[PDB]
Structures are given as C-alpha cells and as structure tokens.
Design a binder for this molecule. Structure first.
Ligand SMILES: CCCCCCCCCCCCCCCCCC(=O)OC[C@H](COP(=O)([O-])OCC(O)COP(=O)([O-])OC[C@@H](COC(=O)CCCCCCCCCCCCCCCCC)OC(=O)CCCCCCCCCCCCCCCCC)OC(=O)CCCCCCCCCCCCCCCCC
Ligand SMILES: CCCCCCCCCCCCCCCCCC(=O)OC[C@H](COP(=O)([O-])OCC(O)COP(=O)([O-])OC[C@@H](COC(=O)CCCCCCCCCCCCCCCCC)OC(=O)CCCCCCCCCCCCCCCCC)OC(=O)CCCCCCCCCCCCCCCCC
Ligand SMILES: CCCCCCCCCCCCCCCCCC(=O)OC[C@H](COP(=O)([O-])OCC(O)COP(=O)([O-])OC[C@@H](COC(=O)CCCCCCCCCCCCCCCCC)OC(=O)CCCCCCCCCCCCCCCCC)OC(=O)CCCCCCCCCCCCCCCCC
Ligand SMILES: CCCCCCCCCCCCCCCCCC(=O)OC[C@H](COP(=O)([O-])OCC(O)COP(=O)([O-])OC[C@@H](COC(=O)CCCCCCCCCCCCCCCCC)OC(=O)CCCCCCCCCCCCCCCCC)OC(=O)CCCCCCCCCCCCCCCCC
Ligand SMILES: CCCCCCCCCCCCCCCCCC(=O)OC[C@H](COP(=O)([O-])OCC(O)COP(=O)([O-])OC[C@@H](COC(=O)CCCCCCCCCCCCCCCCC)OC(=O)CCCCCCCCCCCCCCCCC)OC(=O)CCCCCCCCCCCCCCCCC
Ligand SMILES: CCCCCCCCCCCCCCCC(=O)OC[C@H](COP(=O)(O)O)OC(=O)CCCCCCCCCCCCCCC
Ligand SMILES: CCCCCCCCCCCCO[C@@H]1O[C@H](CO)[C@@H](O[C@H]2O[C@H](CO)[C@@H](O)[C@H](O)[C@H]2O)[C@H](O)[C@H]1O
Ligand SMILES: COCCOCCOCCOc1ccc(C(C)(C)CC(C)(C)C)cc1
Ligand SMILES: COCCOCCOCCOc1ccc(C(C)(C)CC(C)(C)C)cc1
Lengths: 486, 65, 97, 68, 114, 52, 56
C-alpha cells in the first residue's frame, strides 16, 4: 500500500524537509526585510462584540509591488509554508508518547496528507498539480456546493425571511451567479460585484492634524499625479496638503463624511460642558486642533478603512461558513476561532495578489505554460481537474477572478469560485449523450471588466453585449490585441 | 466531446435516492414490531412489591455484589 | 440503463404498506387495546386489586399460611379480601386518601 | 385563536404534495386493505364446535380424575 | 426601527373558526337519519333530551371504525363485575376478631406507621 | 399562494430590448458633431485605402 | 338526472393500466433553437451577398 511506499522514502525525505525549511527561512527573511521598511502597520482590530480579532484584505493584505523575485520562487515559498503546516503530525509522538505513531501512520498512508518531500516529482508546478489532481480537487469538489448554499442562505437568511433581508435589485444578478448551473450559460463577474449592493459604501478616512477627510477619486488622482511628477518634498507635501484642504472644504460642503450618518460608525461632535462649566451659551468645548489654522492642514500618514460591510463582513459569517470557506480553499480550518481562519484566508488572499502582481511583471498570463496556468487557476479555485478546458477559457477565468479579487471582498470571490464546482451525476448510462458542438472556447477579449454594468431589474434581465461591440473598442482592447496576436 | 457539469458518481456523493427511501421506511417498519412489543411489555408485566414482600427484585449492574 | 439498484415493483408494493400509515391508523388502533387492557380498565383493575387483596391477606391470615392452602381456598380468601377492599367500610365506602 | 397560516398549513406558499401511488394491476395494500386477504374464519366452524366439545370433555375428565 | 412591513393575511385569524365549524358540520352530517325505525323517549314534559338525539351520530361513526368497535366493549363486563361484587360486599359476614385485629385501611394502626 | 400550481412564464418574459442602443446613445451625447463628421472621413479614406 | 332526483354514478372496474391525457408541455427550447436558426440564416444570407459583392 501507500504506507510502506512512503516509509520507503521517509529516510530520503528528511533531508529534503530540512532543505525546504532552510529555503523557507531565507525567503521569509528577504520578504520580511522588505515588508518591515516598505509596508505600513495594519493595526489589529476586534469585532463588534470585541472578543476576537477581525481581518480584511484592504488593510492586512499588502502587495510588494517591486518584489525582486521569480513567480516560481514565490510558489515554492507558499507551497513550503503549506508543507510546514502538513508536518504538524510529527509532534504527536512528542505529546502523546511512543503510542503516538498510529497518527503518523495515518499521515503516511495518504500522499495528500504529506509535504513535498514525499513526492517523486521535482518541479514545483508538477508537484502541485499532482497533489491537486490526486487529493485537493476531490476535497474541494465536495465543499463547493455546500459553501455556495451557505453563502446564499447567509444573504437570504433563515426561516422564510427573504422579504426582510434580500434586495430586489440584486435579484437577477443573484440568480445568474448562483443558478447558472441550471441554465448552462456563462457568468459575468460584474453581476457578482453587484452582490456588494448588500453592503454599504466603503470609505477611507485620511487622518490629519485637524479632522479626518474622506478620500475620493479626485483626491487620489491628484495624489497619483503629484507622485508621478517626482517633485521635491517641499513641493510634494505642499501640493498634497493643498489637495487635502480642497477635499476637506468639498466634504464640509457635502455635509461631512459619509461615516457621520452610518449606523455603527460616527464622528463625535464637540464635547459638552457639564453644569456650571457651561459658560452661558457656549455649551461645547472644542478640541485642541481647533486652534490650528486650516491652512496648516497636514496628513498624519494614518488611514482608516471602513468597508461598511453590513451583510458581507466575515464576522457575521459564522462558525460554519468560515470553516467551509477555508476547506474550499484547501486551508487549515479545524479547532480554531473564526479570527484565526479569517487571518488564514486573508493570507491566502495576499499570496494570490502577490502572485498576480508577479505574473503581470512576468508578461501576463500568456507568458505562462499550460500546466502553470492550470495550477494557478487551481490555486484560485476556479477550475477542477475533470474539465480539460482550452487556453483562452483559462485566461478569461484568470482575468475574471483577478479583477474580482482586486476588489478585496472574500464573499463575492467565494460566490464566483463555487459556481465552477457544481457538477451532477446522471442515474442512466446513455445520458448525458455525447455532445455535437465543439469544446467551450473564449478569449481575454470576451471578458468585460473595463465597463460598468448596472444591475438588471427583477424579472427583466437583459442580454449580454460583447465588449467588441462597444464604440472605440479596438482602441480600448489594443493591449489585449497586442498580447494575443503576438 | 461530453456535456459539461456532468460526471460519474463517487463514494462521497452519498447513496442514491432509492437507498435514502429504504433508510426512511425503517422506523415505519419497526413500528409494527415495536407497538405490539410495547403492549406485550405492559400486559406481561408483574408488580415488583407487595405488602407481604420480604424481598424486592435487585439487579446488580456490574456484578460487584 | 439505470446505474442504481433498481427496486422491484413488489418490494415497493410491500414498503407502501408500511409507509402509507396515517396518524389515526396508529392512534386509535393501538389505543383501543391499550385503553381496554391498560392501567385504566383491565390491567390496572387486576394489578391494583391484587395489592389490596394481599395486604388484607397478610394482615389477617399471613402470606406463608396462604401459600400453604389450596388454590381453591386461596381464591376464596382472595375474593373475600377483594370484597373487603372494594367495600372500604373504614373509608366510609370511598376510595380516596 | 390561531393564525391563518396554521389552519391552511402554509405561511406564504402552498407546497405541492406528491400524490399517493396506486400500483396498477393489483389491489391496494394498506392497514385497512387487509380483509381482501384475511376474512373472518369461515372454513372450520363445525370443526370448531366439535373441538370445543372434545376439549371441554377431556379437560373435565382429567380435572375430575386429578381432583378425586 | 421603522421597517414598514405590509400586513400579511396569513397572520390574520379568519379561517380557524370556519374550519372548526366545517369539522363540526361534517360530524353532524352523519346524524341524518331516516324516519323508519325512529324512536326517542322524550322527557316527561314531552321535550327532547340532550344525549338522546345525539346517539345516532356517535353510533354511525362507530359503524365506520375497524378495531375500536370490536375491542372497546371488552372493558364493559368489568362494570357488571363491580356491580355484582359491590352488592356481595355490602352484606358480607366477617369475623369480628380479624376486623378488630386487621382492619383494612383504618386510621391509627401502628403497623402501618400512624 | 398557488404560485407552484401555475405556469406564468409567458406573463413574464425577458424583454427584447437591445442594451447597445443605450450605449451608442451615451456615446453620441458625449461626442461633438465635428467628430461625427470626421468618422465619415475615416470611413471614406478607409474605402480608398482598400481600393488602392 | 331523473325526475325528482339527481345522482352520481361511479363505475366498478379494475384499472389495469394508467389513463393517458395529452397535456402539452410548454418549453422555450424549440423556440430558442428556431431563433438560432433564423439568426444563422440571416448571417448566411449576409455572407453570401457580401461574397457576391466582393467577387461578382
Ligand atoms: C483546567 C485547568 C488547566 C490550567 C491550564 C493553565 C496552564 C496551561 C496553559 C496556560 C494558559 C496560558 C494563557 C492562555 O492560554 O490564554 C488563553 C486565552 C487567550 O488569551 P489572549 O492571547 O490574550 O487573547 C487575546 C485575543 O483574544 C486574541 O484574539 P484572537 O483572534 O487571536 O483569538 C480570539 C479568540 C480566542 O482564540 C483562541 O484562543 C482559540 C481557542 C481554541 C484553541 C484552544 O477569542 C477569545 O479571545 C476568547 C475570549 C473568551 C470570551 C469570548 C466568548 C466565549 C464564548 C464561549 C462560548 C459560550 C459560553 C457558554 C454560553 C452559555 C452561557 C450564557 O485567554 C483566555 O481568555 C482563556 C479563557 C479560556 C476559557 C474560556 C471559556 C468560556 C466559556 C466559560 C463558560 C462559563 C464558565 C466559566 C465561568
Ligand atoms: C487546541 C487547538 C489549538 C490550535 C488549533 C490548530 C490545530 O490544532 O490543528 C490541528 C490540525 C487540524 O487540521 P487543520 O489545521 O485544519 O489543517 C488541515 C489541512 O488543511 C488538511 O486538511 P484535510 O482535509 O486534508 O484533513 C487532513 C486529515 C489528516 O490530518 C493529518 O495530518 C494526519 C492525522 C493526524 C492525527 C493527529 C491526531 C491524533 C489524535 C490522538 C490519537 C491517539 C494517539 C495515540 C494514543 C494515545 O485530517 C484528519 O483526518 C483529522 C485531523 C484532526 C485530528 C485531531 C487533531 C487534534 C488537534 C488538537 C486540538 C483539538 C482538540 C482540542 O490537525 C491536523 O490536521 C494535523 C494533526 C495535528 C496534531 C497536533 C498534535 C497535538 C494534539 C493535542 C491534543 C489536544 C487534546 C485536547 C483535548 C483533549
Ligand atoms: C453525539 C453526536 C456526535 C458527537 C460529535 C461532536 C463532535 C465534537 C467535536 O468535534 O468538538 C469540536 C467542535 C468544534 O470543532 P471544529 O473546529 O468546528 O472542527 C470540527 C471537527 O474538526 C470536524 O471533525 P473532522 O472533520 O476533523 O473529523 C475528525 C473527527 C471525526 O471523528 C469524530 O469526531 C468522532 C469519531 C466517531 C465517528 C466516526 C465516524 C466515521 O475526529 C477527530 O479527530 C476530532 C474529534 C474530537 O466542537 C463543537 O462544535 C461543539 C459541539 C459539542 C458541544 C455540544 C454541546 C455539548 C453538551 C453541553 C453539556 C454542558 C452544557 C451545560
Ligand atoms: C473540543 C475542542 C476544543 C478546541 C476549541 C473548539 C474549536 C475552537 C472554538 O470553538 O473557537 C473558540 C470560540 C470562538 O468561537 P468563534 O469561532 O469566534 O465563533 C463566533 C461566531 O460569532 C459564532 O458563529 P455561529 O453563530 O455560527 O456559532 C455559534 C456557536 C458558538 O459557540 C461556540 O463557540 C462553540 C465552540 C465549540 C467549543 C467546543 C466545546 C466542546 C465541549 C465538549 C480549555 C478551557 C478550560 C476552562 C474551562 C472552564 C471555563 O454556538 C453558540 O453560540 C452557543 C455556544 C454555547 C453552547 C453551550 C451552551 C450551554 C448552555 C447551558 C445552560 C446555561 C444556563 C445558565 C444560564 C445562567 C443565567 C444567564 O470561543 C470560545 O469558545 C472560547 C475560547 C477559548 C476556549 C475554547 C475551548 C473551551 C470553550 C469552548
Ligand atoms: C352465549 C353468549 C353469546 C350469545 C350470542 C352471541 C353469539 O353467540 O355470537 C356468536 C359467538 C361468536 O361467534 P363464533 O365465531 O360462532 O364463535 C365460535 C363458537 O364459540 C364456537 O363454539 P360453538 O358455539 O359453535 O359450539 C360450542 C358448543 C360446545 O359444547 C360443549 O361441549 C360445551 C358444554 C357446556 C356444558 O357449545 C354449544 O354450542 C352449546 C352448548 C352451550 C355452550 O359465539 C358464542 O359466543 C356462543 C358460544 C360461546 C360459548 C362460550 C361463551 C363463553
Ligand atoms: C368474571 C370475569 C369477568 C367477566 C367474564 C370474562 C370476560 C368476558 C369478556 C371477554 C374477554 C375479556 C378478556 C379479559 C382479559 C384481561 O383481563 O385483560 C388483561 C390482561 C392483563 O392482565 P394481568 O397483567 O393482570 O394478567 O391482558 C390480556 O388479557 C391480554 C389480551 C391481549 C389483547 C390483544 C388485543 C389486540 C387487538 C388487535 C389490535 C391490533 C392493533 C395493533 C396492536 C398490537
Ligand atoms: C379555543 C380557545 C383558544 C385556544 C385556541 C387554540 C386551540 C389549539 C388546539 C387545537 C389544535 C388543532 O391543531 C390542528 O392540528 C392540525 C394537524 O392535523 C393542523 O393541520 C395543519 O397541518 C397539516 C399537516 O400537519 C396540514 O396538512 C394541514 O393543512 C394544516 O391544517 C391544524 O392547522 C391545527 O389546527
Ligand atoms: C375537540 O376536539 C376533540 C377531537 O380530538 C380528538 C383527538 O384525536 C387525537 C389525534 O387525532 C387525529 C388523527 C389524525 C389526524 C390527521 C388525519 C390530520 C393526521 C394526518 C396529518 C397524518 C393526516 C388528526 C388528529
Ligand atoms: C374534531 O372536531 C370535531 C368535534 O365535533 C364534535 C361535535 O360534537 C357535537 C355533536 O353532537 C350532536 C349534537 C346535536 C345533534 C343533532 C342532535 C344535530 C340535532 C338534530 C338531529 C335534532 C337536528 C347531533 C350530534
């Protein structure tokens, strides 16, 4: 059996395990050295009940744009971290005793339970693909549908209360995202982004020496322009503060930031003066910063991200949905609080984002091989190994989930992913019949990400317009055209 | 080329539907055997103590006595 | 070409007998023997008259001597005791505490 | 006293009930359809009379002999 | 806080009493009887009784039973058993000595406890 | 309440509206007229380019 | 129906096989396919005409 087959290589595996640990240590040293000087401090925050930490990718998932590393080396780093996780049963004899070897036997039985050293293959891509096709796709194909049901029933709620919880504008998008295995039609990712309508407006308060200011597209554009001009800091800070005071005045005219009038958040007013401390009509005591003139408005370098996820937030998910989200992504899930699984999911998210950045540096998706792209999509959990897709479909799938993960929301990501793991079995042998049409093919051009899509009204869905049919599409799609024709 | 979103059954797909039906009707079958057993357990019973009883039925569970 | 263990028509015909029960089909059909031969009517009357009978016997005659007598005289004394208890001359002819 | 949902059996939507199977070509088999197979005893009634007589007589014989 | 939910008719109460009256009407429909063979002893005034004219319905339903109509009568001989034994006991002759030594359920008997 | 015991798919069909019309209309509204007249030149010059 | 009477008559006969009733099933698949046919024929006529123009 596999037990003795793995015991045969267990002596040959310890050397590779220690070598891999050394590689992991070196890579983590490099990555942390870069992170400790280029990355900001993502402070720890506790949930609404204030007992366990909560995690979001916008603050905690940092991407080192400028990491001098090959994509395969980062794949090795992540895979060896997972191998360190898989090495945990070696501690069982050192806590239970000499009779703690039967867990080690169960570990050595299945090769999917084991780290890379027990594999005969050499390349990290082939090793990863072997592990997936042997154990991981099967393990994932039995969690996808149930996770999808949990996400649905998280939105619509329990006990026949859909009229109180669901929205009538996300209805057709909800149907297309969650019930397209009935129709057999492809899905548009923008219809999954429409699920964010359940949430509120995500804001970003920049903290100044006077007041917090809400970030906008205009202020961000101006800051990017100043950053691109490469000016002296005496001019850079001046222009930044000019844009900042302009935005401050703009929001003060708007009626304050959006956060002042949102349930669960708020900016306090001026403090009150109690009793005899009240000096006639002045019932308030303004803060110290009121003395500072507004022309001295300077950014503190501190930021506050407020996703306003009233229905999507990972805290309200539950003990079960978090575990299934980590199962479906082939992450550790057992015997831990939802905070720790939240961190694990956010770390997976960060890994995928860094890998996307390195892929874009390496020349996009088309520079990758077929097995490498297959393995990337397997890591993203959008492909199962019993499909045998084309290259264009794989590229479109990558583009889809990459844009969806750029938005930093795990719920819609999982909703998208679980749609690719809804497979049925027929009770008859003749049916399903052999098809007559060719295999499904697509291209990167067929994916519409560069355009906005309004939510279709309930029971009035509209057909899909190809991006090529839009005006001036040959100019907008020129990058993809140059990448594909070459 | 085959049709998509279709596959052969696997062990983790659980039993078929007819097997689930066979699971469901097992209580309904044991009902016919257990209700007569209930009536027999009540009807073929004898009280355990009387005004004259010097002893009472004892049941050593673990044989410690 | 069904890939599942197809169940015969007669097996379904037999299982339908077991799963096509309604609530009243159990309630009344099992309550009639139960109410008749239960703690209310027959079993209760028997088993609760026995207690009074043997109380009277062990008080008046003794259980060992009663065991020594014949089944006929046993039944005679049992009937006398049952009458003494049903009468309840001391409770004012009332089976209450 | 009770809401209409409890009376009609549904809160919002009336769910379809799967009808009862019939098993065409044969009699229904239910707890109430068993008299088709089991009628009251009618074949051995006169034998019942005879056996009751003989049982009474033999019991009386052996009981009287035991008693005497 | 201010959800503005429309009224749900399923939460109303406009079907329970009609349904109960439908059940009672189905019950009373089986009280319909023919004129032939009809007899009911009325009261001495000539007015009908209460239980009298609602026996045909009950026994028309007993007719439809399958098991209770042949079983629930087997507890009835026990009533006559009591009727007979009570009269046997009303005048049963007993020994004075045993009644004074072993009175049944008499108070202040220390052998009982009180 | 008897929604399950009906077939109202015909009462509610998907509309035959082309969303492209809403897109092209927003395209013309944003552009000026001289660019519209220019497109007649871009098309005409493309015809002569294919001719030569 | 009779003079002074109305009645309900039920037959007594075993049903050996089920009774069939043609209730036509509404489905959009045939019209889907016919729409595909019509659109494809439009494009085919278009291609034939364009080929005739480009070659003639
Ligand atoms: C037996 C004696 C054995 C003695 C052993 C002593 C020596 C061995 C080990 C030494 C101890 C070392 C210190 C240590 O372990 O700290 C652990 C732990 C962590 O401290 P920390 O690192 O500073 O945490 C910082 C943040 O929490 C960090 O946040 P985080 O994201 O990393 O993880 C957060 C997560 C913690 O994450 C984890 O630690 C994972 C734990 C699983 C792994 C094990 O949540 C918590 O913080 C738990 C706080 C507890 C309150 C929350 C509400 C709990 C509800 C419980 C269920 C409902 C109760 C019944 C309801 C019915 C009644 C109404 O400290 C504790 O609070 C221990 C409490 C353990 C008992 C909780 C039992 C709750 C139910 C009680 C019911 C009522 C009966 C009691 C009255
Ligand atoms: C406290 C928890 C604080 C940290 C929580 C994290 C954690 O514990 O990770 C566990 C971790 C859970 O898996 P995961 O972190 O979600 O990642 C799963 C992978 O993604 C792969 O996922 P997968 O779908 O491929 O599944 C892999 C498969 C195969 O997993 C394997 O790798 C091989 C199976 C190794 C079994 C080791 C358990 C042995 C149990 C004792 C047996 C008797 C010993 C001999 C007689 C004495 O998993 C299993 O079949 C069973 C795994 C769970 C076994 C129970 C582990 C007990 C953890 C202790 C804390 C919970 C109790 C409180 O367990 C493992 O998978 C590796 C074995 C862990 C050995 C730890 C040795 C220390 C045990 C301390 C006992 C404490 C008892 C206290 C109560 C009494
Ligand atoms: C009784 C019915 C069955 C009992 C099952 C309960 C499961 C216990 C458990 O898993 O605890 C961890 C479980 C949480 O673990 P988790 O992190 O969500 O991961 C789930 C397991 O890893 C999921 O298990 P797994 O997928 O990792 O499979 C491995 C597991 C599977 O094996 C078993 O757990 C049981 C083995 C027998 C079944 C084998 C069939 C195959 O065996 C283990 O190695 C760990 C089990 C310990 O605790 C609970 O969820 C609470 C349930 C128990 C509390 C209920 C109330 C207790 C009564 C209160 C009394 C005082 C009130 C005042
Ligand atoms: C065994 C394996 C142990 C390893 C840890 C188990 C898995 C890790 C875990 O549970 O996360 C820790 C869990 C965090 O849960 P979470 O992932 O953050 O989910 C929160 C979601 O919002 C919640 O999302 P959800 O809604 O989907 O899930 C809700 C779930 C959440 O509940 C859970 O967290 C269950 C977690 C399973 C725990 C496993 C228990 C296995 C028991 C066998 C070491 C402790 C030493 C000290 C002990 C003495 C305190 O259920 C509940 O809310 C009910 C929990 C209480 C059930 C029992 C209530 C009994 C009532 C008795 C009547 C009382 C009447 C008196 C009233 C007085 C007048 C007011 O926090 C803790 O339980 C305390 C942490 C430190 C100790 C943990 C282990 C011992 C206490 C359990
Ligand atoms: C009389 C109480 C019921 C009268 C009206 C109810 C009624 O008779 O319905 C038929 C009712 C049940 O219908 P079935 O299916 O014909 O019952 C079979 C006969 O028990 C089977 O026994 P059998 O009646 O056909 O013949 C047994 C024969 C046996 O003759 C003897 O040797 C007994 C000698 C006694 C001295 O006894 C006699 O026929 C007449 C002698 C007196 C008895 O039969 C009876 O209750 C009459 C005979 C019962 C005698 C013992 C009753 C305790
Ligand atoms: C003077 C004596 C009284 C008068 C004359 C004798 C009585 C004559 C009347 C008829 C005979 C009455 C019998 C009395 C027996 C008795 O005492 O009844 C009480 C006894 C128990 O008494 P004890 O436990 O004290 O010995 O129980 C029995 O006799 C067992 C009877 C079994 C009945 C089963 C009926 C099943 C009906 C089918 C229902 C199917 C539905 C599913 C359910 C499984
Ligand atoms: C009158 C004084 C105030 C007290 C009022 C409340 C009295 C309640 C006691 C009477 C309860 C009767 O309970 C009755 O149970 C039956 C179960 O067969 C329910 O029946 C319901 O459920 C069944 C299935 O279970 C459905 O198929 C059916 O359509 C529906 O009526 C009735 O809706 C309910 O009315
Ligand atoms: C005032 O009311 C007195 C009537 O109460 C009689 C109590 O009956 C006990 C249970 O009786 C039944 C039996 C069957 C049922 C039905 C037929 C509704 C059972 C069902 C739901 C399985 C068809 C309902 C009640
Ligand atoms: C589950 O709910 C059903 C319970 O219904 C029980 C109703 O019980 C009352 C029936 O008793 C009667 C009362 C009157 C009558 C008849 C006497 C209606 C009056 C008549 C025949 C003279 C018109 C018949 C039966």
């Amino acid at each position: 059996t596999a037990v003795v087959k793995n015991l045969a290589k267990l002596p040959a595996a310890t050397s590779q395990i220690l070598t891999n640990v050394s590689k992991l240590q070196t890579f983590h040293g490099l990555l942390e050295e870069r992170r400790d000087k280029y990355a900001p401090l993502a402070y720890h925050t506790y949930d609404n009940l204030k007992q366990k930490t909560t995690w979001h990718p916008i603050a905690h998932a940092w991407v080192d744009e400028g990491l001098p590393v090959s994509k395969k080396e980062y794949n090795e780093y992540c895979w060896l971290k997972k191998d360190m996780q898989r090495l945990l049963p070696l501690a069982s004899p050192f806590v239970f005793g000499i009779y703690g070897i039967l867990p080690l036997a169960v570990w050595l039985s299945n090769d999917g339970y084991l780290p890379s050293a027990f594999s005969s293959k050499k390349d990290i891509v082939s090793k990863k693909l072997e592990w997936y096709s042997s154990y991981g796709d099967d393990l994932r194909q039995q969690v996808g549908p149930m996770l999808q049901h949990r996400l649905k029933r998280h939105l619509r709620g329990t006990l026949n209360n859909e009229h109180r919880l669901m929205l009538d504008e996300v209805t057709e998008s909800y149907k297309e995202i969650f019930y397209s295995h009935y129709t057999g039609q492809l899905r548009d990712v923008r219809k999954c982004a429409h699920l964010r309508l359940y949430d509120g407006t995500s804001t970003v308060l920049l903290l100044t020496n006077k007041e917090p200011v809400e970030l906008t597209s205009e202020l961000l554009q101006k800051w990017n322009a100043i950053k691109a001009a490469k000016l002296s800091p005496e001019e850079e800070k001046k222009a930044r503060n000019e844009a900042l005071i302009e935005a401050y005045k703009e929001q003060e005219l708007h009626g304050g930031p959006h956060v002042k009038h949102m349930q669960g958040y708020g900016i306090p007013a001026d403090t009150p003066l109690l009793g005899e401390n009240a000096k006639g009509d002045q019932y308030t005591q303004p803060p110290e910063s009121a003395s500072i003139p507004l022309e001295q408005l300077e950014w503190t370098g501190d930021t506050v991200f407020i996703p306003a996820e009233y229905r999507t937030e990972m805290e309200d998910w539950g003990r079960e949905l978090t575990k299934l989200a980590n199962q479906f992504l082939l992450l550790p899930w057992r015997f831990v609080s939802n905070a720790w699984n939240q961190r694990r999911l956010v770390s997976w998210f960060e890994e995928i984002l860094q890998e996307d950045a390195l892929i874009a540096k390496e020349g996009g998706v088309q520079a990758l091989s077929d097995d490498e792209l297959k393995v990337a999509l397997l890591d993203r959990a959008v492909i199962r190994c019993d499909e045998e897709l084309t290259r264009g479909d794989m590229e479109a799938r990558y583009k889809e989930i990459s844009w969806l993960m750029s938005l930093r929301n795990p719920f819609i990501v999982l909703a998208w992913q679980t749609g690719y793991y809804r497979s049925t079995y027929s009770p008859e042998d003749d049916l399903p019949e052999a098809s007559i049409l060719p295999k499904l093919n697509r291209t990167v051009l067929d994916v519409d990400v560069h355009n906005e899509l309004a939510p279709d009204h309930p029971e009035k869905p509209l057909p899909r317009v190809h991006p090529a049919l839009y005006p001036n599409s040959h100019l907008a799609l020129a990058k993809e055209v140059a990448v594909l024709a070459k | 080329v085959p049709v998509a979103n279709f596959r052969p059954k696997k062990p983790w797909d659980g039993p078929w539907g007819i097997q689930i039906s066979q699971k469901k009707d097992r209580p309904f079958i044991a009902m016919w055997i257990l209700f007569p057993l209930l009536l027999v357990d009540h009807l073929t019973r004898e009280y355990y103590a009387y005004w004259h009883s010097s002893k009472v039925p004892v049941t050593d569970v673990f044989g410690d006595f | 070409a069904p890939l599942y263990p197809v169940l015969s028509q007669a097996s379904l015909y037999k299982r339908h007998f077991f799963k096509n029960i309604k609530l009243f089909h159990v309630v009344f059909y099992v309550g009639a023997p139960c109410v008749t031969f239960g703690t209310a009517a027959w079993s209760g009357s028997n088993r609760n008259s026995r207690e009074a009978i043997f109380m009277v016997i062990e008080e008046r005659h003794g259980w060992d001597n009663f065991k020594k007598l014949s089944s006929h005289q046993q039944g005679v004394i049992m009937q006398e005791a049952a009458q003494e208890s049903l009468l309840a001359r001391n409770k004012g002819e009332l089976h209450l505490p | 006293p009770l809401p209409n949902a409890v009376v009609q059996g549904y809160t919002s939507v009336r769910g379809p009930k799967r009808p009862l199977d019939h098993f065409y070509g044969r009699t229904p088999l239910n707890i109430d359809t068993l008299w088709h197979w089991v009628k009251f005893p009618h074949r051995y009634d006169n034998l019942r009379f005879a056996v009751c007589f003989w049982a009474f007589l033999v019991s009386a014989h052996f009981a009287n002999k035991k008693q005497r | 806080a201010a959800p503005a939910e429309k009224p749900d008719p399923a939460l109303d109460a406009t079907k329970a009493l009609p349904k109960a009256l439908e059940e009672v009407e189905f019950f009373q429909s089986y009280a319909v009887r023919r004129k032939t063979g009809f007899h009911l002893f009325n009261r001495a005034t000539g007015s009908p009784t209460i239980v009298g004219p609602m026996f045909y319905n009950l026994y028309n339903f007993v007719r439809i039973g399958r098991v209770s109509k042949y079983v629930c009568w087997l507890s009835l001989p026990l009533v006559f058993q009591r009727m007979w034994m009570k009269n046997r006991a009303t005048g049963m002759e007993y020994d004075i000595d045993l009644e004074n030594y072993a009175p049944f359920e008499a108070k202040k008997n220390p052998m009982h406890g009180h | 309440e008897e929604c399950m015991f009906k077939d109202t798919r015909l009462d509610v069909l998907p509309p035959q509206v082309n969303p492209l019309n809403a897109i092209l209309a927003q395209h013309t509204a944003q552009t000026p007229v001289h660019r519209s007249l220019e497109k007649r030149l871009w098309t005409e010059v493309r015809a002569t380019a294919v001719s030569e | 129906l009779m003079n002074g009477l109305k009645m309900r008559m039920f037959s007594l006969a075993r049903q050996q096989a089920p009774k069939i009733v043609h209730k036509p099933v509404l489905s959009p698949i045939p019209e889907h396919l016919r729409l595909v046919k019509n659109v494809a024929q439009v494009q085919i006529d278009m291609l034939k005409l364009l080929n005739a123009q480009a070659a003639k």
